[PDB]
């Protein structure tokens, strides 16, 4: 498992630390890279969007709020939204939780993006349509393009 050429150095460190926290041997870091690419384009695709303030993994305010105590338990410090490493840790925690609970990567991605109760036509906290199925397909492909085994 090596860094994909297109993934910026700073991002790779973030996702690799997150991977170490879950004991995933570099593979989760590949999945998180794909997630971050889609969500924020490594931080270059944030401006212009109403969800810009939501950071690298685009975790929505009410979702961040829901997982605050769990984040602190997992990582030993309070979630700091100004920290990019924390943004990645928070996104990783939520994504891991969906994958473990729903039983697969594809489904974890789908429900990461749409919530547990996503249906076609459902909108986000900004009123934008959530295309959770398409999100999952393209992010799963990218994870595989990066060399993801599972
Ligand atoms: C066609 C395509 O891949 N377009 C990308 C946009 O989807 C993308 O926006 C992000 O999309 C996610 C759903 O796929 C949203 O959860 C997320 O909020 C949204 N990010 C922002 C900042 O609005 C943009 C930005 O990364 O990149 C396009 O390539
Ligand atoms: C990564 C991210 O932030 N995804 C968002 C989903 O969490 C989110 O779903 C809603 O999350 C709330 C807090 O966890 C829940 O109270 C609520 O049940 C849940 N809604 C559904 C339909 O599952 C969605 C929609 O708000 O936005 C995503 O971007």
Residue 139, H or E segment: helix 132-145
Is residue 117 within 8 A of residue 94, CB to CB? The reply is no
Cβ-defined contacts of 35-42 (< 8 Å, 24+)? 35/91, 35/95, 35/109, 35/112, 35/139, 36/11, 36/88, 36/91, 37/6, 37/7, 37/142, 38/135, 38/138, 38/139, 38/142, 39/91, 42/7, 42/8, 42/11
Q: How was this structure determined?
A: X-ray
Total number of domains constituting the chain: 1
Q: Residue 32 has which token pair?
A: 């998180």
Q: What is the DSSP string of 53-92?
A: GGTTTT--HHHHHHTHHHHHHHHSS---TT-HHHHHHHHH
Query: How far, in Å, CA of 91 to CA of 111, rounded?
Result: 12
Residue 129 bridge partners (DSSP): 123
Output phi, psi for 129, to 5 deg: -65, 130
Provide the residue range defining the domain that includes 96: 1-150
Is residue 102 within 8 A of residue 125, CB to CB? The reply is no
Distance from Cα 63 to the centre of ligand 2, integer Å: 6
Query: How far, in Å, CA of 66 to CA of 45, rounded?
Result: 25
Is residue 59 within 8 A of residue 90, CB to CB? The reply is yes
> At a CB cut-off of 8 Å and minimum separation 6, what does 119 contact?
none
CATH number at residue 39: 1.10.530.10
Residues near ligand 1 (Cβ within 6 A): 38-41, 45-46, 49, 51-52, 58, 113, 135
């Amino acid at each position: 498992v090596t860094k994909p050429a297109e993934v910026p150095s700073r991002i790779w460190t973030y996702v690799m630390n997150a991977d170490n926290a879950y004991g995933k041997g570099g593979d989760f870091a590949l999945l998180l890279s794909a997630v971050i690419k889609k969500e924020s384009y490594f931080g270059d695709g944030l401006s212009g969007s109403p969800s810009a303030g939501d950071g690298l993994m685009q975790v929505q305010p009410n979702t961040r709020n829901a997982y605050l105590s769990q984040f602190s338990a997992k990582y030993g410090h309070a979630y700091n939204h100004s920290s990019e490493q924390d943004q990645v840790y928070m996104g990783s925690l939520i994504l891991n939780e969906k994958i473990v609970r729903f039983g697969s990567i594809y489904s974890g991605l789908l429900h990461y993006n749409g919530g547990d109760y996503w249906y076609p036509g459902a909108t986000d906290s900004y009123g934008r349509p959530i295309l959770a199925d398409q999100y999952a397909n393209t992010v799963y492909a990218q994870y595989k393009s990066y060399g993801g085994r599972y």
